[PDB]
Amino acid sequence: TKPMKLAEVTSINVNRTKTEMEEFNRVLGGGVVPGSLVLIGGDPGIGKSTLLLQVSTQLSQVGTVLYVSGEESAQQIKLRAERLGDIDSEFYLYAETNMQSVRAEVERIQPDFLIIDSIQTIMSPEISGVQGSVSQVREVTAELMQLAKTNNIAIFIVGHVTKEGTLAGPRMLEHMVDTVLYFEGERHHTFRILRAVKNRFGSTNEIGIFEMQSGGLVEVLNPSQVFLEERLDGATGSSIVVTMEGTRPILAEVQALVTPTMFGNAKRTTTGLDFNRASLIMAVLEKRAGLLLQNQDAYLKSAGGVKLDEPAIDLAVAVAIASSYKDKPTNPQECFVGELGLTGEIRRVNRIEQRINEAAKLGFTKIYVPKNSLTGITLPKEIQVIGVTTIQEVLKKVF
Amino acid sequence: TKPMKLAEVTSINVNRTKTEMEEFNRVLGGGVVPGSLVLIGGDPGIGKSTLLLQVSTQLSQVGTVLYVSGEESAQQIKLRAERLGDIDSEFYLYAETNMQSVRAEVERIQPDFLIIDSIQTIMSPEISGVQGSVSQVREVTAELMQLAKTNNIAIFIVGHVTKEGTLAGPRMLEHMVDTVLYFEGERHHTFRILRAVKNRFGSTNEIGIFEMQSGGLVEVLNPSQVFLEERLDGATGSSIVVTMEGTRPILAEVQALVTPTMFGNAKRTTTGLDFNRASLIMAVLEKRAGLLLQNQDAYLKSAGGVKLDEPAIDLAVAVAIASSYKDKPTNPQECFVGELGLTGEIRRVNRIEQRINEAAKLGFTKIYVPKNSLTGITLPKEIQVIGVTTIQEVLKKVF
Amino acid sequence: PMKLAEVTSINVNRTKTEMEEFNRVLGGGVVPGSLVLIGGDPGIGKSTLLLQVSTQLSQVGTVLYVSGEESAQQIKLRAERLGDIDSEFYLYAETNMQSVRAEVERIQPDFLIIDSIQTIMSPEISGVQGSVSQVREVTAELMQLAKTNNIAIFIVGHVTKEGTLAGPRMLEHMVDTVLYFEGERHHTFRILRAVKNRFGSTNEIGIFEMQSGGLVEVLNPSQVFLEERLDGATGSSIVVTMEGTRPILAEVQALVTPTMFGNAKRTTTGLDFNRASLIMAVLEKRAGLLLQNQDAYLKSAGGVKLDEPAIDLAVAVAIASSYKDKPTNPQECFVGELGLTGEIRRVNRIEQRINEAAKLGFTKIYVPKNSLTGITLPKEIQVIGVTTIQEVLKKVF
Amino acid sequence: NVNRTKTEMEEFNRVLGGGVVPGSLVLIGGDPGIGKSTLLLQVSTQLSQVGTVLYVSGEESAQQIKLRAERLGDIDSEFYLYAETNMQSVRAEVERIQPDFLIIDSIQTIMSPEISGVQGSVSQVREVTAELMQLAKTNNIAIFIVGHVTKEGTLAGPRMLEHMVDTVLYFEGERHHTFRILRAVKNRFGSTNEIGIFEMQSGGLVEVLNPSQVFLEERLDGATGSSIVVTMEGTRPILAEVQALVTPTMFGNAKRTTTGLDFNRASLIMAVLEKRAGLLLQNQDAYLKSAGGVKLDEPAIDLAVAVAIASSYKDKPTNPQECFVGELGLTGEIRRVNRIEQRINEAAKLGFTKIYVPKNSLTGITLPKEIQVIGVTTIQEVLKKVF
Amino acid sequence: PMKLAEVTSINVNRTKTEMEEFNRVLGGGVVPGSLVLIGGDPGIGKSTLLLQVSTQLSQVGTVLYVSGEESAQQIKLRAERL
DNA sequence: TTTTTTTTTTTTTTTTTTTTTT
DNA sequence: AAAAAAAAAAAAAAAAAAAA
Ligand SMILES: Nc1ncnc2c1ncn2[C@@H]1O[C@H](COP(=O)(O)OP(=O)(O)OP(O)(O)=S)[C@@H](O)[C@H]1O
Ligand SMILES: Nc1ncnc2c1ncn2[C@@H]1O[C@H](COP(=O)(O)OP(=O)(O)OP(O)(O)=S)[C@@H](O)[C@H]1O
Ligand SMILES: Nc1ncnc2c1ncn2[C@@H]1O[C@H](COP(=O)(O)OP(=O)(O)OP(O)(O)=S)[C@@H](O)[C@H]1O
Ligand SMILES: Nc1ncnc2c1ncn2[C@@H]1O[C@H](COP(=O)(O)OP(=O)(O)OP(O)(O)=S)[C@@H](O)[C@H]1O
Ligand SMILES: [Mg+2]
Ligand SMILES: [Mg+2]
Ligand SMILES: [Mg+2]
Ligand SMILES: [Mg+2]
């Protein structure tokens, strides 16, 4: 080795190969990078070995794959494969735990892709410690990193997780690999969310959602079924907003029902929405747009119980209230994003590009967004993007 | 050797070289200091080596740079460089991992600035045990502080972190080096913040905020939704406040809508503020300034959902309420800062100099502050700092 | 020799720095013949603090500053930032314990400051610079020098990655005083707190603010000053509250106005509105202020949360001054809990409170009379015992 | 058993098995600065009234100890100080005094220079301890040992000392506590677990005799609407005062503003008084507080709360030496309470003339003769007896 | 043990105390080869119960009573109250 | 024939990780 | 929010042991 000037452009471009799973490719950042290390953590049972077996089958159509498993015997893995089904043209399988015995086979198969079905179950013969020991994990991961960086092998490592929900072993492990994925999914849903917390080769904002099914993990193409309901005739008082949950844009319906107050102080009731925010929005509508609302009771709901924290919902909430009060329908493919100011201005929102992209992917026609958010934003040309400046403009255009 | 002197001693000055990233220069106390040690810690994948490759390029425009790394090969570094820039001042890469060859090549090329990358990923063949040993990093740190002082090389060091997020290694590491930086970001946010916990050459309070983007880190300059020209021109009931978001001042905007109640009682709906605080402020206004407000509803909001609960916002809240009740605008170039006492006094506030300086940087023309806070303040030339001591003074000056 | 109880003792000649917020932590001043240990996180400010101490003590006696971790140029550059060498002192930057022992015997300094015992070493043994044996022998040498020359020694000790002193636990036994210098990244105050001091109370902490011109002592941590009340401002009063161990001054403010619409609000901040409405009920029953038909609005100034029962008297006097439209004197302070019978009940730490009010230059403090039993009033403060709220209201207004 | 000498700190006796037995060792460990040397100087001075005492110190020269003694002020009849570290010289001074109560101010700062090790060496301290054992055995001297502690607290070589040591107890306290707790952990001659507690002061350590948190008796004159109740701070009984202000609802509607108590419990209590006693409280505001901010909320308070409310409504004073304990039922029955014996004994210790208690709870308890324990059945009976 | 296939069977030698209201809470008696754990509210009778049970089992067989938490003198002085 | 010494061992302290407990 | 289980390292008590 020698020091070199940066203009010694020995950099060959990374011809990263795509698997068939677009959800997997996107989290990785376009594809599997040769010579990368990917560490997949996640709770027991969540689907890590299923995911890796699927991608191993798909990659075996394009390159040689070696699947290495300490924790499971070859018959179990073949039983899962036949439950999933693939030609498995060049898919090698190797149940092993001794690092020298895997390294020897790696140096003859020359696998383009290597799966390590659990790092905590594979041991160096050098280190005396138990298979989950910190020193064992350190030595095995350093040897795998040598194999990867020397032979351009892409290595997928399954990591055991502590009861905290964070990867076990020395933090050196998270420092040394190139990509760290978590695989997780709460019991309220069937969906399994794959997310990158580190990715030296791509954006860590991309997340992939799978559903676990008999016969494998299948991609879910719409994360949010809860909007899907085609509207009744009439159906006044509904609007749709591209809100946000964690990092993924999710599109959700807001509904309102405005009715004349009787025999009490006018009272306002919500679900999934802060009633303070709704009271503000109703005050803005009554002031700036002249909707008589201090004599109306109002009821607001988000479909599917998705809780709408962020201020970007306020414009869609106002449009829902207006649609109910006017008793006139919005279009089922109009979508609304923006904070509503008490001076009636529509205020810019973060992540505007992702929201417009997601609205385009779900096939909406018109998305209304704050005019000042549009600066330098490139729209997808298939969806009409309307920049709006004040609530009176939105009401006059929608109604 | 055998010194021993009175305090009359050479007092040699410290020169500084600024990077082009003012957000980075700020944290170091105004620029890189020759012969200093700066230690960078932070979560895996946070952006440390992008930041250091950016600053490595900028220093490379004004001096020779040697970038060592044991983490990554020269090809990966060059691919990153192409991703984030034009290679407009080429510098040296060295993929070395053993300290003797580093010391050799650094003595031969004799750089102005040196970057180690991770101190935990370099070892010394003369001593001790495993990579990342406490025994190893201590001795490498001693070698670096020597090489630094013998040559006046400024050295930047990446440090691993524990799972708790504190710097790894023996505390001798955190004592021998001169500057210790943390690079961090909460998962609910897009920003990365860079903060000093120790800095022998400047204040630690100055943090720097970056956004991660496809072309690298970019300094945000404005951590807030307050973009001045957002204001709806004819807007009334809005005012801006300089608020401490922890250690950093941020702009925030307080909006009020004030309107007569059409019921036997009046609402006090408030988002982002304590409604008891707003109710106290309206009682101060009604008693001292004579605004008839018990007949009026008030609705109050903070822009962008920022939670504003420090006493310094009371003045801007009072001015927003008064602006709405009077239906007169305020100039969007004025900031307000001050606690409001039930006497109508504007009480002094903490960190007043930071607040004035940050109001100055984003180009505000006036800021109203407690007059008693003005003592010893270095107030910048570009902004007229208007001392005030009663709410009625503010209302006469502004309305 | 067992000299029984006949040995003769002379009072320690406690010298003082100008930083009273430092002197308080040592329990009144710097004793001679003594070891002080300063611990704290890296970067906290220990060297800045001991530089300022050196420069101040140099006005009283000879100071020698030694530092194995920092060159004399860096120390002089810091001193030039902090101020000027008008009180010039000796600076050695030595690492050899034998050399500093010889130099101390030559110069006979009144005060010695060692900025890292983790870098002094003696050649009689060798090893890692911070080795337990090296620090133990060096600190034994320092215990000799302290006794032999009556020298006050300030030692900077390193700290582990938890907030505890490194090196042998025997260290905290040999030394006479142990200080931790501590702070929090969300803040910018530094607290200096003792964990051991056999020459004086360890119930006192010093507070500092790190600034460009050094560690400024924060004599008054509250945003509460006698200079800043509006001349005729009614409806506020001062109370000596306690933040754990530290007496903290606080102002309570009250706005009383007729309840023109609806029914009586009791909107409150920093206080508790149940406490406040109790106090208004006591005033209305016992003192006769017609406060039922009044709205009342109360806040702590400065956003300090007030919990303890000692605030009741100050809150009552703030309400009463707001109702009566008669200002309280800004230099009078109130402490005491209010009973629903209108009695004023005893409070804890009464002496530490009166001492803090005296030290902050309050001309007068009101206290529950029965708490005066066995009390030791300072000279610079007038202390008034009161028995009932009627007595207070007659005396104040 | 063999006889016990008592120090004047009865708190110290009770943790030390009821008193220091002669001819045996005691080791007090604890964090530096906790107060070991102050405690042992007070103990040694109190024992000086019984016989000769020697205090040996390496870690503190005689002048500093004398300064501390003159701070505390206690008279020091035949109190010996000895600044020494040569253990053989200590042993010889033992025979030049023949003490009766010996103190070593730290085992880690005395050395027999011939034998072994450095002053910290486990062998050196163990062997010094083995010599001390012979000196204890020979002259029946009770020897108090100060222990250093490990960073963890484990007495800096615990096992080999502790088996020779007989009795070990730990002196400790937290960063903010004015109190320091002296916990006995092993003891051949008394309750193997106990906790002594002291407050540290500039006058020296002072016992916490009676509970830590009682603060009372600031009663004024004709203070209607006040009553006293015995309540538990877990296992400690404490004696606390309830105050009530009852006043007509001149404006608005009846408030129930309450602090310390639960306003639901208080609402039940005023409903019970309204129905069973016939107090017209529904048109009254009633304001209730526990004195001193004590979180006084356990079922046994309801009788005292009822008597405070009734005293305030009637505007007649409760006697300042009457105490009440009792749960109140919605039928006006007064129900049993958890630990009535301990409450009556605390009431007696604080010198209360009466305690009112639930009848059906006097069965099988030994009423102390100094206090008039009164059984009451019903709230109407209580209000007849008191008012 | 080494060889079994549902064979050797000493059965439960269930040994009573004189208090049947103790025996009834177990299987009608104590069981050899077993650990019984007793908890309870502190000082309420927890040790009094087991000391008395010892004074009743001592009639049937040898009982060794070990206390880390109380002195042998105070133990025997309490037992004398029985 | 004691004196290093040096392995072996204890054991303590620092530090990092992780299983319980609100 | 709190503890206890492994890893790494230094301090040290001890002895196999070869010297000086
Ligand atoms: N018919 C089915 N047959 C087998 N597995 C199924 C079936 N249906 C669902 N599964 C799911 O398959 C999951 C098993 O997880 P896998 O993908 O096989 O491996 P893994 O548990 O993620 O990896 P580890 O290291 O063994 S914890 C379980 O959570 C089951 O819910
Ligand atoms: N298009 C993008 N391409 C590459 N990286 C991206 C991209 N967008 C964001 N990144 C971020 O780049 C981060 C990697 O930053 P790095 O500086 O290379 O790693 P580091 O952990 O900070 O430092 P080391 O010592 O190299 S591990 C990832 O965590 C991503 O979040
Ligand atoms: N203009 C400024 N220039 C230099 N330092 C400043 C400045 N302003 C504030 N500082 C503070 O100075 C602090 C440094 O404190 P130090 O005096 O180095 O304490 P120390 O770390 O204990 O000293 P040692 O013994 O050398 S490690 C930094 O943490 C800064 O917060
Ligand atoms: N006016 C006061 N004067 C002197 N000491 C005080 C005073 N007030 C409190 N103290 C306390 O007295 C303590 C002094 O420590 P000691 O009473 O000597 O116990 P000790 O430190 O354990 O003794 P050893 O065995 O030498 S370590 C300190 O912790 C102080 O907090
Ligand atoms: Mg598996
Ligand atoms: Mg890197
Ligand atoms: Mg220093
Ligand atoms: Mg002592």
Cβ contact B388:B338 at 8 Å:
yes
The structure tokens listed for E64 are 């060794």
Which residues contact ligand 2 via a Cβ below 6 A? A 175, 198-204; B 44-50, 71-72, 117-118, 158, 212, 214
Nearest to C345 among D108, D109, D218 (CB): D218
Nearest to C9 among D63, D78, D151 (CB): D63
Q: Which chain E residues touch D1 with a CB distance below 8 Å?
A: 73
Contact present, D and C (at least 3 Cβ pairs less than 8 Å): yes
Q: Whats the size of chain D, residue-wise? A: 387
Q: Whats the size of chain B, residue-wise? A: 399
3-state secondary structure of B381: coil
Cβ contact B191:B209 at 8 Å:
yes
Please report, to the nearest 10 degrees, the dihedral formed by the alpha carbons of residues A373, A377, A378, A379 taken in order.
-10
Cα-flanking dihedrals φ and ψ of residue A322, to 5°? -60, -45
C-alpha C117, offset from chain centre: 27
Cβ contact D191:E70 at 8 Å:
yes
Report the distance separating Cα B242 and Cα B240, nearest Å.
Answer: 7
Residues 6+ apart with CB under 8 A from D320: D217, D219, D228
Report the distance separating Cα D259 and Cα C280, nearest Å.
Answer: 14
Report the distance separating Cα D202 and Cα D71, nearest Å.
Answer: 8
Nearest to A153 by CA among A32, A35, A65: A35
The structure tokens listed for C119 are 């870098």
CB atoms within 10 A of CB A362: 20
Looking from the CA of A394 toward its CB, the CA atoms found within 13 Å total: 38
Tokens 């005094």 sit at which residue?
D97
Nearest to B162 by CA among A196, A332, D143, A166: A166
Nearest to B287 among C73, C255, C303 (CB): C255
Q: What part of C 375-394 touches D (C-beta under 8 Å)?
A: 387-388
Q: How far is CA D327 from CA B279, D221, D306, D332, D382, in A?
A: 42, 28, 10, 10, 13
SS (H, E, C) D4-68: CECCCCHHHHHHCCCCECCCCEEEEEECCCCCHHHHHHHHHHHHCCCCCEEEEECCCCHHHHHHH
**Ligand in nearest proximity to the CA of A79:** 1
Q: Whats the size of chain A, residue-wise? A: 399
Nearest to D43 by CA among D196, D161, D187: D196
CB atoms within 10 A of CB A240: 26
Report the distance separating Cα D367 and Cα C247, nearest Å.
Answer: 45
Cα-flanking dihedrals φ and ψ of residue D109, to 5°? -140, 25
Nearest to D66 by CA among D84, D80, D52, D49: D80
**Ligand in nearest proximity to the CA of A69:** 5
Q: How far is CA B272 from CA A90, A281, A343, in A?
A: 60, 14, 17
Nearest to B342 among C94, C229, C235 (CB): C235
Nearest to B20 by CA among B216, B164, B279, B157: B216
D243 to chain C, closest Cα gap in Å = 6
The structure tokens listed for D244 are 């009530």
Q: Which chain B residues touch A280 with a CB distance below 8 Å?
A: 269, 271, 299, 301
B170 annotated to bind ligand: no
E58: contact with D, CB 8 A cutoff:
no
Residues 113-152 of B with CB under 7 A from strand G: 128-130, 133-136
The structure tokens listed for A33 are 């990078």
- β-bridge mates for residue D236, sequence order: D233
Radius of gyration of chain D from its Cα atoms, rounded to whole angstroms: 28
Looking from the CA of D34 toward its CB, the CA atoms found within 13 Å total: 23
3-state secondary structure of A330: coil
Elucidated via: cryo-EM
- β-bridge mates for residue A367, sequence order: A335, A385
Cα-flanking dihedrals φ and ψ of residue A17, to 5°? -95, 135
3-state secondary structure of A284: helix
A175: contact with B, CB 8 A cutoff:
yes
The resolution of the experimental structure, rounded to one decimal in Å, is 3.2
Going by alpha carbons, the residue nearest to atom 2 of ligand 1 is A214
C277: contact with D, CB 8 A cutoff:
yes
Residues 6+ apart with CB under 8 A from A203: A29, B214
Q: CB burial class (10 A; 0-12, 13-18, 19+) of residue E42?
A: exposed
Report the distance separating Cα B329 and Cα B232, nearest Å.
Answer: 10
A178 annotated to bind ligand: no
Report the distance separating Cα A334 and Cα A377, nearest Å.
Answer: 20
Q: How far apart are the first and last CA of chain E?
A: 42
Residues 144-203 of C with CB under 7 A from strand G: 168
Cβ contact D197:D179 at 8 Å:
yes
State whether the beta carbon of B111 lies below 7 angstroms from any atom of strand F: no
Q: What residues flank ion ligand 5 with Cβ within 5 A?
A: A 49
Burial C17-51 (b: 16+ CB within 10 A, else e): bebebbbbbbbbbbbbbbbbbbbbbbbbbbbbbbb
The structure tokens listed for D84 are 């020494």
**Ligand in nearest proximity to the CA of C173:** 4
Query: Angle CA(D34)–CA(D36)–CA(D42) in degrees, nearest 5?
Result: 125
Query: Angle CA(B343)–CA(B348)–CA(B350) in degrees, nearest 5?
Result: 145
Report the distance separating Cα A340 and Cα A312, nearest Å.
Answer: 8
Cβ contact D288:D309 at 8 Å:
yes
D40: contact with C, CB 8 A cutoff:
no
DSSP A389: -
The structure tokens listed for B293 are 């407000």
DSSP E strand boundaries for B226-372: 238-245, 248-260, 296-302, 334-336, 339-340, 346-347, 366-370
The enclosing H or E element of D119 equals none
Going by alpha carbons, the residue nearest to atom 8 of ligand 4 is C201
Cβ contact A97:A116 at 8 Å:
no
For chain A, what is the largest distance between any 2 Cα atoms, rounded to a whole number of angstroms?
87
Nearest to A254 by CA among A243, A267, A268: A243
The enclosing H or E element of B186 equals none
Q: How far is CA D219 from CA B51, C369, D42, D215, D242, in A?
A: 69, 12, 35, 11, 12
Sign of CA dihedral D243, D246, D251, D257: positive
Cβ contact D180:D35 at 8 Å:
yes
Q: How far is CA C41 from CA B175, B198, C184, in A?
A: 9, 9, 10
Cβ contact A377:A352 at 8 Å:
yes
Report the distance separating Cα D125 and Cα D85, nearest Å.
Answer: 12
Radius of gyration of chain E from its Cα atoms, rounded to whole angstroms: 16
Q: How far is CA B91 from CA A277, A340, B63, B67, D168, in A?
A: 54, 50, 9, 8, 67
Q: Kindly identify which residue of chain C lies nearest to residue B135, measuring between CA atoms.
A: C128
Distance D301 CA to G4 C1' (A): 42
Radius of gyration of chain B from its Cα atoms, rounded to whole angstroms: 26
Nearest to B359 by CA among B237, B209, B243, B207: B243
The enclosing H or E element of C254 equals strand C246-258
Query: Are B287 and C257 an interchain contact pair (Cβ–Cβ within 8 Å)?
Result: yes
How big is the C-D interface in CB pairs under 8 Å?
130
Nearest to D75 by CA among D98, D47, D54: D47
State whether the beta carbon of A171 lies below 7 angstroms from any atom of strand F: yes
Distance C162 CA to F15 C1' (A): 10
Task: Render A97-156 in DSSP notation, one character per residue.
Answer: -BHHHHHHHHHHH--SEEEES-GGG-B-SS--S-TT-HHHHHHHHHHHHHHHHHH--EEE
Cβ contact D203:D181 at 8 Å:
no
Burial D65-74 (b: 16+ CB within 10 A, else e): bbbbbeeeeb
